[PDB]
Every structure is written in C-alpha cells, then in structure tokens.
C-alpha cells in the first residue's frame, strides 16, 4: 500500500487517535480512544472469542461493552489498552508492519517518565521497530501554523497545555498543564442535565452527550446577559433530536457548559480559568516578548472546534490586559489535525531522518539514557 520508506505519523491524542502515513494532509484512521470489554459471559457459540474491542468496533457496540478510557488527565492508566490500540492500528487499518518504516509519535507536554519509558519499551522490545522518536505536540502545531512565535493553547480531552514559543524558542519552565478539558465539561453538562430532569449514569449516554456537545454547544459572548435574555427563551432554546429519537430540549445549558473553563469554581477547584492561567503565564514570560505573544497566540486541540472561542478570548484578554496595543488572535483552519499535519512535514526532512534513535544504542544505553538524549 505504501511504496515510500517514511515514518508512520500516529498522533495518540487523548480522546481521538489519528494515524496516517507521512506526507498526507489528514489522518486516514481516526477513531476515539476507548476500549470496550465484554461485561458478561455468554453461553452462545460462534461469536468472536476476541476479549478486547477497540476503536470503531467498540463505538458500534457501547451497550454490551463496559467502556474504559485508556488515558486519564495525561497519565497512562492501563498499558494493555496501549498495546491493543497500537496492535489494532498496525494490523487492522494501515495493513503495514512497523518493521519496515519508522514511527514518529506525538506525546503531551510534561508527561510522566514512566509513560515515556513504557511506550518506548513496548515499541522496541515487543515490536521490532527500526527507530522511534518522541515529540511534543506544541512544536508540531506551531510548525503546521507556519510561524515561529506565539503561545499554543492545546485543549485535548482530559488535559490542557499552554506552551509559549517565541522565535522558535521553547520554554520548558513556563509550560503549565491543567486537567480541565472535554471530560470535565461533559461531567458538568451531565450533572446540569440531571438537574434539568433527564438523569443518566452510564458511559454510553456520556459519550452521546459528548457528541451532542461537540455538535451544538458553543461559547457565550456575554454570560450574564445571555442568562437574563434566556430567562424568557424563544430562539435561545433549541430542541435536539437524539439519534435514538427521544426529543431532548436544551436551552441555555449549551453556552454555560464551556463556561466552566472560565470559572473552575463550578467544579470546586482553586485553579484559575484557562484565560487567567494563560494571562499569568504571559506575566511569567519577559516583557519584551509579551506583545509578540499577544499578537501570535495559537490554539490547538479538538475542544477548540466550538464556535465563539476566538471572540470570548479577545474580550477576556482585552478586559485583563491594556487596550492600547493590538491583540490579534489567529486560529488556523482545521487546527485539530494541524498537529498531525506537522508530523507529516516533519518526517520528510533528511535531517530528521538523521535524528532517529535506533534499537542497538537504546538497548546498550537503556531507556533512562534515551530520556537524557532527547532532553
């Protein structure tokens, strides 16, 4: 299927795995990060004895399979799910073995050392891979953006990373990760819908309402004013049609769901909102480059697909920062895949072909030394 000896770019982002060959502009195999395990034991004869579903095979059946998240906040919980999702991506979709081409994986900023050593060991010992490389997502996203300056805000599913890069220079001391993202928003919407009257307590419905949020939920331009005008609703409340057919009616809750990002007090945490944390990060940077960080801020992550985030960011930053300079916020189209796109354009360089880590040096050095070599 592939006639070019190039690394397979597999972005294992929290919530959605995006795998594809280098050189492509979009991932071909896109599936959620979920593992379905048979809950009961059947006396039936003939069905697949497979004890571990994955991807679309699990999405197609969520009532029988108990759903487990292979990644939580960033820390890898179960490694069997890791081996399952890579083995599946290798021998069920791409139809190619890892013994013929490299593999450029993308990991989140500020992750545990155990996670890195574990994935590297599974990719070297178990699977025969000629060479591995771990890369931070923020750099590849800035590559795909086509710039060298700005602060990347990557909001995945269970973690949110703010990474400032000015003139290409990474700042490992200022990268601050906060576990507020799509899962805590799904939980907030679920508890407020339970407050509305429709109560559910199973994961399949949780994924359904997550999809409903992805499709409908947006960000408000003025929270309190929308609350007041929605008190007497007319066009502000919408009636959604569940894929099963049950008629759901959702009004203001939509534009109050992502608001939890701006007010973490809703989930009883002393952490500051994403905008205030980004602002504090900007103060932690130097003054000289602060204006450039204001003018080149970039966004990444699937959570940014909601309509109305750019305007909300502009008003909040204008209210926090002075209103004398110019603070333009740029969001490139299809930003979610941009990271992966970067991977593709990063795997075609010959120099990058010279910066890989082969098996033998890793085996003698050991995983810890490999951690030192990368950084």
């Amino acid at each position: 299927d592939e006639d070019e000896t190039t690394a397979l770019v597999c972005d294992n982002g929290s919530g959605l795995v995006k795998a594809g060959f280098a050189g492509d502009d979009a991932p071909r195999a896109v599936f959620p990060s979920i593992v379905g395990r048979p809950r009961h034991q059947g006396v039936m004869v003939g069905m697949g004895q497979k004890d571990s579903y994955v991807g679309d095979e699990a999405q197609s059946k969520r009532g029988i399979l108990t759903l487990k998240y292979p990644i939580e906040h960033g820390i890898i919980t179960n490694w069997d799910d890791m081996e399952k999702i890579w083995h599946h991506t290798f021998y069920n979709e791409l139809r190619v073995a890892p013994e013929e081409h490299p593999t450029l994986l993308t990991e989140a900023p500020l992750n545990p050392k155990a996670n890195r050593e574990k994935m590297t060991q599974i990719m070297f010992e178990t699977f025969n891979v000629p060479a591995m490389y771990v890369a931070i997502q923020a750099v590849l996203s800035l590559y795909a953006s086509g710039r060298t300056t700005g602060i990347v805000l990557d909001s995945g599913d269970g973690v949110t990373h703010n990474v400032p890069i000015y003139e290409g220079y990474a700042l490992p001391h200022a990268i601050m990760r906060l576990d507020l993202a799509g899962r805590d928003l799904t939980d907030y919407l679920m508890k407020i819908l339970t407050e509305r009257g429709y109560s559910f307590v199973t994961t399949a419905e949780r994924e359904i309402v997550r999809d409903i949020k992805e499709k409908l939920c947006y960000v408000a331009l003025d929270f309190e004013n929308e609350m007041a005008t929605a008190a007497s609703s007319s066009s502000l409340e919408k009636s959604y049609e569940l894929p099963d057919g049950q008629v759901i009616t959702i009004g203001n809750e939509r534009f109050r769901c992502p608001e939890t990002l701006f007010q973490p007090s809703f989930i009883g945490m002393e952490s500051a909102g994403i905008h205030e944390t980004t602002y504090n990060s900007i103060m932690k940077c130097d003054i000289d480059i602060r204006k450039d960080l204001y003018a080149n801020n970039v966004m990444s992550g699937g959570t940014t697909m909601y309509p109305g985030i750019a305007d909300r960011m502009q008003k909040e930053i204008t209210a926090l920062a002075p209103s004398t300079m110019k603070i333009k916020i740029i969001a490139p189209p299809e930003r979610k895949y941009s990271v992966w796109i970067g991977g593709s354009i990063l795997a075609s360089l010959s120099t990058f072909q010279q910066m890989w880590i082969t098996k033998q040096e890793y085996d003698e050095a050991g995983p810890s030394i490999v951690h030192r070599k990368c950084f």
Binding site: G23, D24, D25, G146, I341, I345
Partner: peptide, 26 residues
C-alpha cells in the same frame, strides 16, 4: 509551506472501483 493534496485519490483504485471491467487503458 506547501503540500500535495491527499484527497486526490489514486486513479488506479478509483478507476477499478468506478468501472470494473471497463477500465483497461487507464
């Protein structure tokens, strides 16, 4: 920064899937 479009599906596979036996020269 440029790229080659990937929705440009390969003609051989596309020609087989659209025609069947009629695709012989392409």
């Amino acid at each position: 920064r440029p790229t080659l479009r990937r929705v440009r599906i390969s003609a051989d596979a596309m020609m087989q899937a659209l025609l069947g036996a009629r695709a012989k020269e392409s």
